Amino acid sequence: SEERKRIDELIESGKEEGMKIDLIDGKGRGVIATKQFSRGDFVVEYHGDLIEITDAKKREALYAQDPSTGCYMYYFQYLSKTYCVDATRETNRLGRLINHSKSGNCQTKLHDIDGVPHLILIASRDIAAGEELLYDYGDRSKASIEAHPWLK
Amino acid sequence: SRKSKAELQSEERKRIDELIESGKEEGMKIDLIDGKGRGVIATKQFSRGDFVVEYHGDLIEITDAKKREALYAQDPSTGCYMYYFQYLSKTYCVDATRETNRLGRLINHSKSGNCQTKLHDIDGVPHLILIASRDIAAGEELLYDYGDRSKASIEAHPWLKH
Ligand SMILES: *C1=C(N2CCN(C)CC2)C(=O)c2ccccc2C1=O
Ligand SMILES: *C1=C(N2CCN(C)CC2)C(=O)c2ccccc2C1=O
């Protein structure tokens, strides 16, 4: 990833330069690059509510009663404990809308600031403008399964 | 009308049987919709009570459905297309997670929609169908209330009750 100071400043400001929401055949919503990114560049935060697993379960019980909701819980482990970034609410933050690929052009990185973990996407290779932004949801999937033993 | 309630039902049942057998889904298209992604749009008129489309997929029982959910959770490209429902003494599920062509799975939720789910029996096999709850004009998004579907999923998933 690029310089830590710069990443911290982007995370704090929430500036989401260089991408747009689009509608994509066979998928629905996705995110399209509107600028070039170099390998290692910060692309965007997977931004939502950072919560612990107890609160995530309760939230999943609410979301299950609300048919408009999509699946936006991103589970992960930080310093032994399980956390979740809950991006279920419709906002203007774009990371939550980035779709899955095994050969995507972004990768998840856990980037902590003063003891608070953030899930961010970094460019895994150079990205041309016009490409759909995509990352491997494998780790996300695994963590979901780990957090719901009834699935497993 | 000279047609009794029972005559209407028999007539409508024949119409629906033939559309299930054929699988024809005329009068609609897959679309991309701002703020939603995929959905289905009416491209002809439908009158209140008309068959619109089947919610087509693999009919399975609850134990099987929960086994499939564990597999779908491993493949991140899967959407949420399990439709649970009660039929007589049992819960079933129409699994449309691996349907391609058949559009019923793609119809979106609303509380103010223009379709209604009905259970249609063909020789003891339950089929989930969508019928028009009012007249629908070409250009309109097809929409039904997922309430019953949502309540049945919760009943099948005790983990999601709390
Ligand atoms: C996606 C889910 N959702 C949220 C609720 N809405 C109605 C459908 C989409 C889940 O409910 C859920 C629960 C447990 C594990 C995984 C998921 C999803 O992937
Ligand atoms: C939607 C789900 N899916 C299938 C798996 N993919 C990866 C995400 C979307 C669920 O997994 C699920 C499980 C239990 C209850 C409800 C749901 C969904 O709504």
Report how far residue A49's alpha carbon sits from residue B156's, in angstroms, rounded to the nearest whole number. 28
Q: B87 - beta bridge partners?
A: B90
CB of A23 closer than 6 angstroms to any ligand 1 atom:
no
Q: Please choose, from the candidates A37, A118, A128, A17, the residue with its C-alpha nearest in 3D space to the C-alpha of residue A74.
A: A118
Distance CA B61, CA B68 (A): 11
DSSP B124-160: TEEEEEEEESS-B-TTPBPEE--HHHHHHHHHH-GGG
Handedness of CA A73, A77, A78, A83 (dihedral sign): positive
Domains identified in chain B and CATH numbers = 1-162 (2.170.270.10)
Residue B108 assigned to a binding site: yes
Is the separation of the CB atoms in A35 and A18 below 8 Å? yes
Contacts of A80 (CB under 8 A, 6+ apart): none
Report the amino acid identity of residue B112: S
Dihedral of the alpha carbons of A28, A29, A35, A38, in degrees to the nearest 10: -90
Task: Name the residue of chain B whose CA is nearest to A137's CA.
Answer: B76
> Inter-chain contact A67–B154, Cβ cutoff 8 Å?
no
Angstrom distances, CA of residue A30 to CA of A25, A27, A33, A83:
10, 8, 10, 25
Q: In sequence order, what are the residues at sequence separation of 6 or more whose Cβ sits closer than 8 angstroms to the Cβ of residue B91?
A: B61, B62, B84, B85, B152, B155, B156
Query: B154 — contact with chain A (CB < 8 Å)?
Result: yes
Looking at ligand 2, which residue's alpha carbon is closest to its atom 10? B80
Resolution (A): 1.7
- Residue A63 is which amino acid? Y
Experimental method: X-ray
Q: Cβ(A63) to ligand 1 under 6 A?
A: yes
Q: What is the largest CA-CA distance in chain A?
A: 43
Cα distance between residue A128 and residue A32, in whole Å? 10
How many angstroms does the Cα of residue B77 sit away from the middle of ligand 1? Answer: 13
Assign 3-class secondary structure to B71-101: HHCCCCCCCCCEEEEEECCEEEEEECCCCCC
Q: Whose CA is nearest to atom 5 of ligand 1?
A: A64
- Helices marked H in B73-159: 147-156
Where would I find the H helices in chain B? 5-22, 62-72, 147-156
Contacts of A23 in chain B (CB under 8 A): 32-34, 37
CB burial of A102-120 (b: ≥16 within 10 Å; e: otherwise) equals: eebbbbbeebeeeeebbbb
Amino acid (1-letter code) at residue A29: R
For residue B78, report the distance from its CA to the centre of ligand 2, in Å. Answer: 8
